[PDB]
Amino acid sequence: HDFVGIGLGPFNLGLACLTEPIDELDGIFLESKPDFEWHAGMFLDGAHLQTPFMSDLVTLADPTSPYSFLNYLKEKGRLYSFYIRENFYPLRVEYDDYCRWAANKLSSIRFGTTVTEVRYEDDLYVVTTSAGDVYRARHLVLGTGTPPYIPEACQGLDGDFIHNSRYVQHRSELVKKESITIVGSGQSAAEIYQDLLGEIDVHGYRLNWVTRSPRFFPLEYTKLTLEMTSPEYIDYYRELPEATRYRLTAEQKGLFKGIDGDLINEIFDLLYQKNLAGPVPTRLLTNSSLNSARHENGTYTLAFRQEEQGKDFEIESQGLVLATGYKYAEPEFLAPVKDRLVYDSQGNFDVSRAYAIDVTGRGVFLQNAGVHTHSITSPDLGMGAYRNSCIIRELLGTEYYPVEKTIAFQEFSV
Amino acid sequence: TVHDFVGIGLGPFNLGLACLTEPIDELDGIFLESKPDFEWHAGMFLDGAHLQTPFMSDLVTLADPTSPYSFLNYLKEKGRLYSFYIRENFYPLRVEYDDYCRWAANKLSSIRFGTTVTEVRYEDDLYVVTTSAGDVYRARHLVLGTGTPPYIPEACQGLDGDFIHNSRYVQHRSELVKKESITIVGSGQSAAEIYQDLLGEIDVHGYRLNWVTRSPRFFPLEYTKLTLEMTSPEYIDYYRELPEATRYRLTAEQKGLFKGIDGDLINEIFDLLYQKNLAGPVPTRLLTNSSLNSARHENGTYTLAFRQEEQGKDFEIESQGLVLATGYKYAEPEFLAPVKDRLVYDSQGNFDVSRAYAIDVTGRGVFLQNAGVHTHSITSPDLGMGAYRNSCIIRELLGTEYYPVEKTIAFQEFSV
Amino acid sequence: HDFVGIGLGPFNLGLACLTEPIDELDGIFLESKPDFEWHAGMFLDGAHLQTPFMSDLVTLADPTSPYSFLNYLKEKGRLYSFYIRENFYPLRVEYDDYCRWAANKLSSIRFGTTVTEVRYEDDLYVVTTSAGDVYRARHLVLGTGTPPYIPEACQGLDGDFIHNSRYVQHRSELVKKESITIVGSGQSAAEIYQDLLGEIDVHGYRLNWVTRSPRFFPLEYTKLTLEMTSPEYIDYYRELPEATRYRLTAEQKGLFKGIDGDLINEIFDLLYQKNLAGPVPTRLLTNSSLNSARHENGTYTLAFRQEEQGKDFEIESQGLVLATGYKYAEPEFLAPVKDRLVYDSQGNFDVSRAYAIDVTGRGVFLQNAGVHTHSITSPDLGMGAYRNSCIIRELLGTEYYPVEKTIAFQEFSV
Amino acid sequence: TVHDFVGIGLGPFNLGLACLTEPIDELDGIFLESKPDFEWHAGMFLDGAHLQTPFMSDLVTLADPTSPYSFLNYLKEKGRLYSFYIRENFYPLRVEYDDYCRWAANKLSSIRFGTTVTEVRYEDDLYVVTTSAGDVYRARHLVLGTGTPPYIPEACQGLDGDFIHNSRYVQHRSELVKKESITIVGSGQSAAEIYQDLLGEIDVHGYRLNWVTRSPRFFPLEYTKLTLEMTSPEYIDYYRELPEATRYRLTAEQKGLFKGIDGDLINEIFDLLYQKNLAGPVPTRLLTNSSLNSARHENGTYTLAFRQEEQGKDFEIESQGLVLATGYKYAEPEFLAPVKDRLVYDSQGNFDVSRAYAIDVTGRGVFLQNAGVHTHSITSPDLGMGAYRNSCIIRELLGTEYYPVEKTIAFQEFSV
Ligand SMILES: Cc1cc2nc3c(=O)[nH]c(=O)nc-3n(C[C@H](O)[C@H](O)[C@H](O)COP(=O)(O)OP(=O)(O)OC[C@H]3O[C@@H](n4cnc5c(N)ncnc54)[C@H](O)[C@@H]3O)c2cc1C
Ligand SMILES: Cc1cc2nc3c(=O)[nH]c(=O)nc-3n(C[C@H](O)[C@H](O)[C@H](O)COP(=O)(O)OP(=O)(O)OC[C@H]3O[C@@H](n4cnc5c(N)ncnc54)[C@H](O)[C@@H]3O)c2cc1C
Ligand SMILES: Cc1cc2nc3c(=O)[nH]c(=O)nc-3n(C[C@H](O)[C@H](O)[C@H](O)COP(=O)(O)OP(=O)(O)OC[C@H]3O[C@@H](n4cnc5c(N)ncnc54)[C@H](O)[C@@H]3O)c2cc1C
Ligand SMILES: Cc1cc2nc3c(=O)[nH]c(=O)nc-3n(C[C@H](O)[C@H](O)[C@H](O)COP(=O)(O)OP(=O)(O)OC[C@H]3O[C@@H](n4cnc5c(N)ncnc54)[C@H](O)[C@@H]3O)c2cc1C
């Protein structure tokens, strides 16, 4: 093949839809799951995308693509009432249903296929499957995603504690407890906190929301800042000193630790409403580390330290929801071709401006996992079509889908 | 040489039909337009003015989102899609929509600008239309998209001076602001947009600003989502099947469609009035329930006699400027005179246009785009249903549904 | 006494706090309930007023009076909380709790006292209890309110059907059924429909909403039509021919049949959300009168006629909620004084511009129940302070609280 | 004449104290103000401008809603309460709040206008204060409400030409728009208000418009409700008891406080750039991460040397007009020199303001309004506080809590 995509969607899925009309390119994608499924553990009732529907799979690169969210609604017979709904943001299960509708309309996807290991023979890349099948191509696109992150204070933890990755499946058991505690900030943490707080006077549990963030940061979604999600900002950002880039990565607040401002205010309105009937058994703590964690009987003892104040405190809770983020890890299957991959000074891929990670500037491409190289655009649905069109532009020698070089009104470079 | 159909007039409705029929090789008719190029209501291109419907109400999207004439594709070609994505506004600006349609119009090859239709005949089972210049086109079908010309009350017919209908406001604005008195007659979106524009500079020119309307209130555009479901195929079929007397009642009772103002515009008009009033009394005047009964010019000044209808009292205003935002009205063009016997009429002498949007004896020969409120209610002049109607028209020009045409879209049931 | 207030709704309770600091005025108020209680039974969680908080008991006539809503929050220790909430509309239970707080701080209210008879002897009005006690004064202020209305077609039906006046207390039984129907439109009708919907997939019921109105009318509170809730419009409106005012009263819809537009929108948004999981067992019907209703088994058979189309249809549902309006009926306790009261051509009170209903034009005052003479302003909480200060103006002969003559930017009279 | 306290300066904070002290018989101080009458930041009275805090942040309400000096009472007396009720806007206009403040000061008798305090020393267990006229006022307590004068970067000290600080924009606007080039330095609400004002008329005057700021982003004002709980008594109880190094650190990192823009204003700026750009390229530049390090004037034009700090590159801009929106900063007034021995300072040389808002040896003799970010965080220059701060000051002047003082208002816990 020309290329082989490992892991499908929503970034590699978008590439599948973008190359299907290109006959000059024949690539194939292998996904481990039996069918496409997004973050199904966060499918709370009413939950919606944090980016408008134009950040779908194709539209930002080609609004005429047959796999656009608008065309999907037209086929489902739902376009007109969506027109009446007049909401830029699709609901989460609506988006999950849309990409599954797109994946099943393609012919170049092989589900139930977990790649085992990769290496490099005869200037081609060989990829091995769990079943034993082996594909080969000159290029590979890595869209394996970002596994959930667990703090080391919860390594080797036992009990029924969950990452927010699997909340919907275990809300069954959480509401039956006497006390629930959520660790970390971010959209998922607040969505879960609002969901539990909404029924706190029916199940009767205590509700704790602890985070080390100094504030409950709002998502940085004012339009002048949204212009940093731009081709010309990546051009600027990428040629900065890598330590200043790793500092901008570490300092960034709203990207992974940011809550929708509306959700923040709805949480306050709900706290106000419940507090009319009497004292609400809830706690919201900031500037608080999670240092220790142990399981006894069927309750957890968590040791926190208020870093700013310089004092420790412990809380006990039978339920434990780790709304900690996600973190990319070197996949095991790229061990035999590590010396073809280029690394930075800190131990991760130094992804090039053209989203390549190997000795040739156009060999293996990397979707996501590039905040230290492309900042907030790396895990953004709104920049999936842009990154895929540049990966296309390197697989051919041509620009099949036009690639904008300036979108913003402001200048980031000089 | 005889075509399948001839489109007379190139407004947003016929232009959308042109964009929807271009990928159909089984069809190919021709479009005749008076203007040298596509031009919308340019006399209302006020700074910041925008559409009353979301951008999906473009020429094609609601029938085919993959169409190359989408508004989104237009933004992609001009290098503006990502900035529009950040703008996060469903409503394109008026000049933005005007440039988009002109961009789509010059992408087509089926449009004849600068030709006005003079005659329409029926001969040899075909329709024969002639140009001012004498050019003659023939086709089996006709699609009339002539729009609705501006309406002028009879109290203003044959009136002297420099008074304007709101359709020419931008061209005469620099001369209006020089006057010491300006009066706006009628309600609706355009009247409020003009009032807000003049009120915003009332402090630098020093004119009086009068806004008089016959409607009992400043109606809002009825744009709540359950009422939006009345803009459905379900409601049209319900509505079309009811007695004609009940149909003509409900269009007369229609408030928000032609005489409605965007609620947000109403509230910033009030906010602006609150703002200006802090510095002292502002020379403005907002009157309701007032009909314009007579008007006369003298001294470069107008004397307009009004009657408060429900209070039963008369009064009149003296103003140097006069802006008539009295809306528009369809008049049957005389070029249809040679085939009037071929057309369907109702009790009050208007077109009894079918559910398939047909106005002739065949029920499928001559189609009519706008000017059908008494038959399809608020659907007729709505950009959000231009792709639906064009889909129905294409369905009968062909023998097949080229684009899918929805059966039901709402959660309500209007019939039983 | 100088006046006797019959009934302690928001209007008469407002008059009670506006007259407390006036020493030259000694009035007293008789309420049937043992304490103040607003429209409980519509106290849905999150429900709120339809007018901003300065439409309380005093502020629009005297922002300095100690019975303000803001002073109430200051004493409860909730002002800064309310300040951050930045919402103009208080919650229903919050307003109800506030009015009771003001009522109990007063000296002039006698709870648990139902008035049985009014009479007039030697130029005084004699008011007698059902307990047997007797009060008499020179003036009367009737704040009886407007009791629920039921469309006669449901007179003397068996079952368990309710008026929306009793929704909260019967909700636990309503959800048990498999079919619920709501008749009539308006704010609470939609407040109930949106409450039953949203849990339509946890219980098993079908949900029917049937109204006679042609639209789901929005409570249109655009600021220029809100200027019709002004003294100058009442001066205009009252001096109209009463045939025209009876036409205006009947033909405009929205005052009692209007829904909050944002409530309409989330009703649609919720319908859109539920419909993703499959067809929703709900029906929204317009233009349809309720002509007949029966009850055999635990099921209602209701005969409807869609008057616009001219066709009949019936609906069988175990549950029946009558969200119809409220209607004023002249109380029987004013029978011995009936010939001292003024009536119009249609047989109801010809209320003066000064809100009087008797021959003197300044002896008996009537709160509410004056739409045919004062239009939008009579059942409006925002005009309760205006009307009360005009009542105080006639009792004292002087304007204790300033009474605005004009407030709007437009002119209604010419 | 020996009073209880003498209040120096009459801004919103000391005026609020004047309104909360008038109904207190046990207290009678006196207020000295340089200006002939109250006047707020008039140099930023752009049309439509409004407060950043709701109207309850007036002079009294958050301490006593029944006060006769409340904003709502002011509207009632002015005959404007009902349409403000219809306006349904939490935020008074700047000109509205300014008129409201003069209306309250005129109603009091404790204010001396046109008096400038020149010297304060400590004699006979009393504070003496001397005015420019030479009049003497004596009291044991002082309340310092002199505000914060404008700040000018050292690159602009001794600069020639007609450059202005943003605090005088209204008076210089008519001459700025005449120029060919205007450049705005710094970010924040005022900087963005000025940029939007000039950008709105960029195609009528034809100037180039430059907006240069050192901040890496265009920060929105941190006004989400969970953050707004940080301006609370319990937070500054927690904040004040922190190590001074940590306090000065968090004061320095503060973004939205003085360098934050209203998010709605950011969005309407982008929308306005989108609207103007339709008509062609708009001659304006928005630069960030840029520090101004040198400036000079030659023949009516400024040449400004900037450094993109993050990128590590230099660049220069030439502009005829220079607007410095560089904020404000407190400086110890020279009239406190003879009493410097009695004032408490911290390690970096600033007032070690008590949590009771005192700055003197006795912890209750001299009180400081504003200029206390390093000890009271976002609360010190906030109109939402100041009512709270005045009640605490009155509680130290008296021995009793005259107005209730909240100790907890938030749902979240800041301390452990
Ligand atoms: C709840 C939630 C909501 C979000 N919402 C948004 C939003 O609105 N907008 C936005 O821009 N971002 C959003 N994000 C962030 C980000 O865009 C999403 O996480 C996105 O789904 C990640 O896309 P991805 O393709 O890079 O990774 P993934 O979606 O995680 O794709 C990884 C895929 O690779 C497969 N895989 C794993 N191992 C192998 C293997 N060995 N071989 C083959 N396949 C393998 C996995 O099964 C999976 O299907 C959200 C994140 C979360 C958690
Ligand atoms: C300012 C304004 C804003 C509006 N905004 C909206 C909105 O946001 N949404 C909405 O749904 N509706 C809107 N409307 C209402 C409606 O959509 C418009 O009236 C719309 O432009 C109607 O287009 P049309 O195709 O019916 O005809 P028109 O736009 O009126 O065009 C008819 C064309 O036919 C040509 N023509 C006439 N006679 C002949 C002839 N004999 N031969 C050849 N050509 C001829 C004319 O020159 C003209 O170009 C708006 C109306 C106005 C006035
Ligand atoms: C659910 C609901 C919400 C509303 N929300 C708003 C809103 O947001 N804004 C607005 O402007 N309007 C609103 N209204 C309309 C109007 O403000 C209310 O109807 C209002 O409560 C009317 O109060 P009232 O003083 O007329 O008497 P009511 O509140 O109706 O009650 C009068 C009192 O008189 C007592 N009484 C009756 N008979 C006797 C007797 N014989 N002797 C002694 N006492 C007696 C009753 O016990 C009762 O306590 C709402 C109405 C309803 C039903
Ligand atoms: C344009 C602008 C808008 C703002 N908007 C808000 C807002 O919406 N909300 C908010 O919370 N904060 C706002 N602020 C911040 C802050 O609340 C205001 O700056 C506020 O005016 C500060 O109050 P102050 O009394 O301490 O200062 P000032 O109002 O500046 O008080 C200084 C006064 O003291 C007088 N004075 C000084 N020295 C002497 C002396 N020696 N003798 C006599 N008199 C003297 C001066 O003449 C002047 O009248 C804004 C600031 C600015 C610049």
Residue numbers in the entry:
A (entry chain D), C (entry chain C): 12 to 425
B (entry chain B), D (entry chain A): 10 to 425
Pull text from the paper.
Herein, we report the first structural and kinetic characterization of a novel alkyl diamine N-hydroxylase DesB from Streptomyces sviceus (SsDesB). This enzyme catalyzes the first committed step in the biosynthesis of desferrioxamine B, a clinical drug used to treat iron overload disorders. Using the electron donor NADPH and molecular oxygen, NMOs catalyze the first committed step in hydroxamate siderophore biosynthesis by oxidizing a primary amine in alkyl amines and amino acids, such as lysine and ornithine, to N-hydroxylated products. SsDesB crystallized as a homotetramer with each protomer consisting of two dinucleotide-binding Rossman-fold domains: an FAD-binding domain (red) and an NADPH-binding domain (blue).
